[PDB]
Each structure stands twice: as C-alpha cells, then as structure tokens.
Design an enzyme around this catalytic site. Structure first.
Site, short mmCIF file in Angstrom:
data_model
loop_
_atom_site.label_atom_id
_atom_site.label_comp_id
_atom_site.label_asym_id
_atom_site.label_seq_id
_atom_site.Cartn_x
_atom_site.Cartn_y
_atom_site.Cartn_z
N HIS A 62 35.72 30.37 41.03
CA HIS A 62 36.52 31.86 41.25
C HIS A 62 35.50 32.78 41.71
O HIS A 62 36.13 33.76 42.51
CB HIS A 62 37.06 32.16 39.77
CG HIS A 62 37.92 31.31 38.79
ND1 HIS A 62 38.93 30.99 39.28
CD2 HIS A 62 37.29 30.77 37.78
CE1 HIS A 62 39.54 30.00 38.39
NE2 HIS A 62 38.72 29.94 37.35
N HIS A 92 29.18 39.62 39.27
CA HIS A 92 29.84 39.01 40.35
C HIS A 92 30.62 39.76 41.23
O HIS A 92 30.34 41.06 40.73
CB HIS A 92 30.59 38.01 39.57
CG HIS A 92 31.92 38.41 38.95
ND1 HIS A 92 31.85 39.25 37.57
CD2 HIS A 92 33.24 39.17 39.18
CE1 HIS A 92 32.81 39.83 37.18
NE2 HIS A 92 33.72 39.80 38.15
N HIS A 94 34.26 40.50 44.01
CA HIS A 94 35.57 39.91 44.58
C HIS A 94 35.31 40.45 45.87
O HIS A 94 35.17 41.43 46.23
CB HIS A 94 36.69 40.71 43.68
CG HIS A 94 36.64 40.43 42.30
ND1 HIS A 94 37.38 39.45 41.81
CD2 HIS A 94 35.79 40.90 41.35
CE1 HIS A 94 37.21 39.52 40.51
NE2 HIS A 94 36.29 40.32 40.03
N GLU A 104 39.25 45.07 44.14
CA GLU A 104 40.59 44.91 43.30
C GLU A 104 40.89 46.51 42.97
O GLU A 104 41.99 46.67 43.18
CB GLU A 104 39.71 44.52 42.07
CG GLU A 104 39.28 42.96 42.25
CD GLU A 104 39.13 42.29 41.05
OE1 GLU A 104 38.60 42.39 40.11
OE2 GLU A 104 40.01 41.15 40.94
N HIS A 117 31.16 43.86 40.13
CA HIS A 117 31.13 44.09 38.70
C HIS A 117 30.03 43.48 37.87
O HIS A 117 29.79 42.40 37.78
CB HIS A 117 32.52 43.23 38.32
CG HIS A 117 33.91 43.52 38.64
ND1 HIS A 117 35.06 42.99 38.58
CD2 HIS A 117 34.12 44.68 39.31
CE1 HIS A 117 36.05 43.67 39.30
NE2 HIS A 117 35.47 44.86 39.59
N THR A 196 40.02 41.44 35.05
CA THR A 196 40.93 41.45 36.16
C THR A 196 41.12 39.80 36.31
O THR A 196 41.70 39.44 37.32
CB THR A 196 40.14 41.94 37.30
OG1 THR A 196 38.81 41.28 37.39
CG2 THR A 196 40.06 43.58 36.93
N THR A 197 40.55 38.76 35.77
CA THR A 197 41.12 37.19 35.82
C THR A 197 41.71 37.00 34.50
O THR A 197 41.03 37.70 33.23
CB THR A 197 40.02 36.35 36.30
OG1 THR A 197 39.09 36.13 35.52
CG2 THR A 197 39.57 36.95 37.69
#
Ligand SMILES: C[C@H](CCC(=O)O)[C@H]1CC[C@H]2[C@@H]3[C@H](O)C[C@@H]4C[C@H](O)CC[C@]4(C)[C@H]3C[C@H](O)[C@]12C
Ligand SMILES: [Zn+2]
Length: 258
Positions: A62, A92, A94, A104, A117, A196-197
C-alpha cells in the site's frame, strides 16, 4: 481486505468491508484556510526526534513504511493540541502518478504531489494496538511535498527503494534521521480524524504542517517505480495511493497561527 486503490477495490468500495468509512470523523479532509479558526491557546509543537532509532523499511503493498523502535520514549511528539506523550512508530507517504495530485489532505482544494505521515501513539495506552482503539490514541503529523528542489534528507529513502520494489520486501534501514524531512516552520492545522486506509479507525489527532517540503522530480519519480504487486507478478505501479477528501461533518479545523 483485498482493498486497494484500483477501480474495483479503491476508496469508493472500502465502506463495504469497513462501514466506518462513512463515519463522523473520517480523514483526510479539505483544509479551508479561510474558515480554520486561529486558536491562540494552542501550544507550539514539540518534535523530539534526536534519539530516533529507525530499523527497517518495508513495502506493504500500500505504501513503503520506515519503522522505528518504539519500546522506549526515543522519538516523541508532544505539545500542540496533544495531552501526553506520543511515540513515533513509523512513517510513510502517499503520492500521485502526476505532480498535481498525491496528497490526501488538500488546502483550499489544492492537491500536493505527496504527503508524509509520521505516525505516533499515546504512551498512556501501553501499546500501539491498544492506542488505536482510543479516540485520542494516535497523533499523525502530516507534511505536504511539492516538486521543486531536492530534499537532501529524503535521498537515503529514495536510494533504498530499488531493494523493496515489490509487496512484502523489506530492507534494513538503521540510523535514518527523520528530522531531515521537516520544514522550517512548525505552524500547523489540527482536527480530530481517522486513519486514511482501512481499518479507518477514528483514533487520530491530525496535525498538518502549513509549510510543505520540496522534493525533486527525480525523487518523486523514484516513488512511482515501486510496485503494489508481489515479486514476479504483472507490474502494477504504486501510484495514486491516496484517499480523497471526506466530509468535514461536525468538526472545526484549528490553526496554530494567524
Ligand atoms: C493503516 C495505518 C496507515 C494509514 C495511513 O496510510 O496513513 C498504519 C499506520 C501504522 C500502521 C501499523 C504500525 O506500523 C505497526 C504494525 C506494523 C505492521 O507491519 C503491520 C501492523 C501494524 C499494526 C500497522 C497496521 C497499519 O498498517 C497501521 C495502523
Ligand atoms: Zn498515511
């Protein structure tokens, strides 16, 4: 649980396995800068990352995660909106397939090229698994990336990505200093939200820095060479691993700055 970011398993599908996806405090959100309320009672953030102990970097299918030793108070976040001490467990990113998308959170509907994040958990709950079950269990420090000049403190991350191209690959990643990923200013917005996942748990105090960091086109291009898939499988480039903005509902975003 076969959730992802594709046409058939992406964010519009998540609610079927994770009904909290349609909950009251979901993230990310758009930050409307002209309706965020300055709160002069908000304290400066205390980012204490001098003793951080990174261990490993992992492609989990992911994102890629840089993991830290969180068995003692080594790298912690305090102050700001937080009460107590939150220990850094991992970070991590995005990112997008193009420089005009990937973040995000958005700022007055602006999407940045990526979003970092730094995930922390409230030590009063003893472990991360307990913390994620509490409304004040996690604090995530969110930092926007824009494409421009290179970020020198990011390069060690970029250069190891070749070794974790596919899902389930990991590599030793010791002595990495997350202070090299911070902008100059610690001015922030803050609101209560969620992961957020999936599992999308509503356990996050979000602290989103106003100042983006700049990374080079070459640096973000290297993010985009990662794979969602496992080794030897048909290649699915790890891009656009972001959830879009969710309804703000009954929440106010507060600003630490005028
Ligand atoms: C899902 C969420 C990331 C959401 C996001 O993209 O911001 C992440 C952040 C921290 C993650 C956890 C922590 O890194 C600690 C654990 C790490 C293990 O590799 C998986 C389980 C584990 C318990 C993780 C589950 C999940 O991937 C978490 C909870
Ligand atoms: Zn994230």
């Amino acid at each position: 649980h076969h959730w992802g970011y594709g046409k058939h398993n992406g964010p519009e599908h998540w609610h079927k396995d994770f009904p909290i996806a349609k909950g009251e405090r979901q993230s990310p959100v758009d930050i409307d800068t002209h309706t965020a309320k300055y709160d002069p009672s908000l304290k400066p953030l205390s980012v204490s990352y001098d003793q951080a102990t990174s261990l490993r970097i992992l492609n989990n299918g992911h994102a890629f995660n840089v993991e830290f030793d969180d068995s003692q108070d080594k790298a912690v976040l305090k102050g700001g909106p937080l009460d107590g001490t939150y220990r850094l467990i991992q970070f991590h990113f995005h990112w997008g397939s193009l420089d005009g998308q990937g973040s995000e959170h958005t700022v007055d509907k602006k999407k940045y090229a990526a979003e970092l994040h730094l995930v922390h958990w409230n030590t009063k709950y003893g472990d991360f698994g307990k913390a994620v079950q509490q409304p004040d269990g996690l604090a995530v420090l969110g930092i926007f990336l824009k494409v421009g000049s290179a970020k020198p403190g990011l390069q060690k991350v970029v250069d190891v990505l070749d070794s974790i191209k596919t899902k389930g690959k990991s590599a030793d990643f010791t002595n990495f200093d997350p202070r090299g990923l911070l902008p100059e200013s610690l001015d922030y917005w803050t609101y209560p939200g969620s992961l957020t996942t999936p599992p999308l748990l509503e356990c996050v105090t979000w602290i989103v820095l106003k100042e983006p960091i700049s990374v080079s086109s070459e640096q973000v291009l290297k993010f985009r060479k990662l794979n969602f898939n496992g080794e030897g499988e048909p290649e699915e480039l790890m891009v656009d691993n972001w959830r879009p903005a969710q309804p703000l509902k009954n929440r106010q975003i507060k600003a630490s700055f005028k």
